[PDB]
Amino acid sequence: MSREVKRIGDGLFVTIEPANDVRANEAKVVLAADNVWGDNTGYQFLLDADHNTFGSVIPATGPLFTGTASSDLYSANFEYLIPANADPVVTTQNIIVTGQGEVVIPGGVYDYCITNPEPASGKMWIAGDGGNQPARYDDFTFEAGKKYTFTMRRAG
């Protein structure tokens, strides 16, 4: 259900700071990664402002999809994305491999998941839950005036 090597997968480590560079009704989300799996595989952050995708478009367990996806899997369901041109393709380069990408979003309620495309296995995996925050989430509140940094690392 999760990508793992030697029973060691990956995970999400969240940091929140005051955001002082956005509007009063805005939050900032950052996705940071540093070649976590050593193979130039990366990550995408998917945000649904309608928070109605958990359990249907975002599966409660297992990868987001395998193999081929409908070309509108993101454009129909997720309003905000990191990177901004993130697309539902396992082979895409529209991923955060090293460094970070960001998105400024309304304060509000969201469903989200973080993906880790792996061409070698044909899976658009959702990242593991071995960090301090689940990598998929139903009705998370991103509060205005705050900056959420989601840092990806290897985890149990």
Author numbering: 360 to 440, 441A, 442 to 515
Task: Provide passages from the article that reported this PDB entry.
Porphyromonas gingivalis is a major pathogenic oral bacterium that is responsible for periodontal disease. P. gingivalis exerts its pathogenic effects through mechanisms such as immune evasion and tissue destruction, primarily by secreting various factors, including cysteine proteases such as gingipain K (Kgp), gingipain R (RgpA and RgpB) and PrtH (UniProtKB ID P46071). Although its detailed function has not been elucidated, PrtH contains 989 amino-acid residues and multiple domains, including a cleaved adhesion domain, small Ig-like fold domains and a DUF2436 domain. Although the structure and function of the catalytic domain and some K domains of gingipains are known, the structure and function of DUF2436 have not been characterized.
We recombinantly expressed the DUF2436 domain (residues Ser361–Cys579) of PrtH (UniProtKB ID P46071) from P. gingivalis in Escherichia coli. Purified recombinant PgDUF2436 was successfully crystallized by the sitting-drop vapor-diffusion method at 293 K. The crystal belonged to space group P3221 and contained a monomer of PgDUF2436 in the asymmetric unit. In this study, the DUF2436 domain of PrtH from P. gingivalis (PgDUF2436) was determined at 2.21 Å resolution, revealing a noncanonical β-jelly-roll sandwich topology with two antiparallel β-sheets and one short α-helix. Met516–Cys579 were not modeled in this structure because of very weak electron density in this region. The size-exclusion chromatography result indicated that PgDUF2436 exists as a monomer in solution. Analysis of the electrostatic surface charge of the PgDUF2436 structure reveals the presence and location of negatively charged patches. The negatively charged patch on β3, β5, β8 and β9 is formed by Asp407, Asp409, Asp431, Asp446, Glu438, Asp497 and Asp498. Although the structure of PgDUF2436 was determined by the molecular-replacement method using an AlphaFold model structure as a template, there were significant differences in the positions of β1 between the AlphaFold model and the experimentally determined PgDUF2436 structure. However, DaliLite search results using structure-based alignment revealed that the PgDUF2436 structure has structural similarity Z-scores of 5.9–5.4 with the C-terminal domain of AlgF, the D4 domain of cytolysin, IglE and the extracellular domain structure of PepT2. Collectively, these results demonstrate that PgDUF2436 exhibits a novel structure with a modified β-jelly-roll sandwich fold topology.
